[PDB]
Amino acid sequence: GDNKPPKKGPPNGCFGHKIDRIGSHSGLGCNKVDDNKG
Fold first, then answer.
1. CB burial string 1-38: b at 16+ within 10 A, e below
2. Does 28 fall in a domain?
3. d(C-alpha 33, C-alpha 4), whole Å
4. Is 19 left (phi over 0), alpha (psi -120 to 50) or beta?
5. Closest Cα partner for 29 from 13, 12, 16?
6. Is residue 38 part of a domain?
7. Which residues neighbour 30 within 8 Å (Cβ) at sequence distance 6 or greater?
8. Are 1 and 26 in contact (CB under 8 A)?
9. Is 16 a member of any domain?
10. 6 belongs to a structural domain
11. Are 6 and 16 in contact (CB under 8 A)?
12. How many domains are there within the chain?
């Protein structure tokens, strides 16, 4: 983080959604998409 300021406090949960592209340090994406997952 630090350099990559995530969205405000979400509705309880990990980092914000996966709206931001790429991200070495940070890695948003609390919600899943309509594709392969784990």
1. eeeeeeeeeeeeeebbbeeeeeeeebebeeeeeeeeee
2. yes
3. 22
4. alpha
5. 16
6. no
7. 10, 13, 14, 15, 16, 17, 18
8. yes
9. yes
10. yes
11. yes
12. 1
Terminal Cα distance for the chain, rounded = 24
**Full residue range of the structural domain in which residue 17 is found:** 1-33
DSSP state at residue 15: S
Alpha-carbon dihedral angle through residues 29, 14, 4, 7, given to the nearest 10 degrees: 90
Experimental approach taken: NMR
8 A C-beta contact, residue 13 and residue 1: no
Find out whether 29 and 5 touch, Cβ atoms under 8 Å.
no
